[PDB]
Amino acid sequence: SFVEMVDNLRGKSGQGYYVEMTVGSPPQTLNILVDTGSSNFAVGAAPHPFLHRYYQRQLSSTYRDLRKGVYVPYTQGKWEGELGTDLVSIPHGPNVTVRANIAAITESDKFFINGSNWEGILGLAYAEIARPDDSLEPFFDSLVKQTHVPNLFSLQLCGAEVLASVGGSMIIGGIDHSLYTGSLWYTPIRREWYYEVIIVRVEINGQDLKMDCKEYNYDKSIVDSGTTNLRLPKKVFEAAVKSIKAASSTEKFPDGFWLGEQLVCWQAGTTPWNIFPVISLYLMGEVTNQSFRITILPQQYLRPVDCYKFAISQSSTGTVMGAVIMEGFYVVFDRARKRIGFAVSACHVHDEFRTAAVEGPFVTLDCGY
């Protein structure tokens, strides 16, 4: 049924991708953020200025209360709510219904986004980082256990007066070959909590940043559909921008732009893409001394707002390969074989001079924290 899953994601630029889901009986429709960077199925369950609809447990005849609260403070914001289980389906995903854990958010701070058009989050990472603890089975774990859907899903994020709308596909239970060209290269999932991986080398315009590879994964590297930007450890970030500033020297910008909080504009197809360099991330291969590179264009790391924001930013929590990396590629979260596959996406955005690429192997003769 993969055909019926194609284009089942939507979103606004910089505000995440969501898939339609129903919870409860009768089905309550909600748009839910696909988030490989968290592990809770958490849905607005009380009025909020940014929510135009929300999950109403009392309207559901199949809701069961777990009589347990959950409080999820985090760096940027916070949500808090009540644990229960209910029946869940994805209308444009696998044709099944599962009983899953649901965090019904009763209060939250800076969690929902104005105009994003989603009402909850589908944390697709592992139990290890779930709240309140790893005993709360994540949605995908329940789905696999209760149905026969293979332990694998794949994301094809396609990107783009009003924020640009983005489209994409979440294929659960398999690999849709029409979604990518060329070969799928796999990098090991180093540990099952976040989707943690290892970056062994990075180049800006073919030039090695030449760092001890531990800096690339300090203190970890993760694949996160719930983060817009490519986020880099401080020391790598600074080296990245310096290298990027040099490659686009002709024509200058204010460091408010480089700090990713200040847009820059051209007008109608005048954008000097060729000025900015490609960025290659080399991920560890399944074979010890091998790696492969994913190369991403400026079209990915300059996010549209013809105005663009610099979608590479600093991190104190390690490297985050967010949406702007994923948008060049078809990304397979092969949980069954503890690996993540990358292929050129059938939908990636590129000129007649450059193209996002996935290429290997590269042999590199210790990179993890």
Ligand SMILES: CCn1cc([C@]2(c3cccc(-c4cncnc4)c3)N=C(N)N(C)C2=O)cn1
């Ligand atoms: C554990 C608390 N939590 C944080 C998240 C978030 C989260 C929460 C709310 C909104 C968004 C978000 C996603 N796309 C674009 N704009 C915002 C992300 N998911 C990820 N991966 N990141 C880094 C988060 O901040 C989920 N739960």
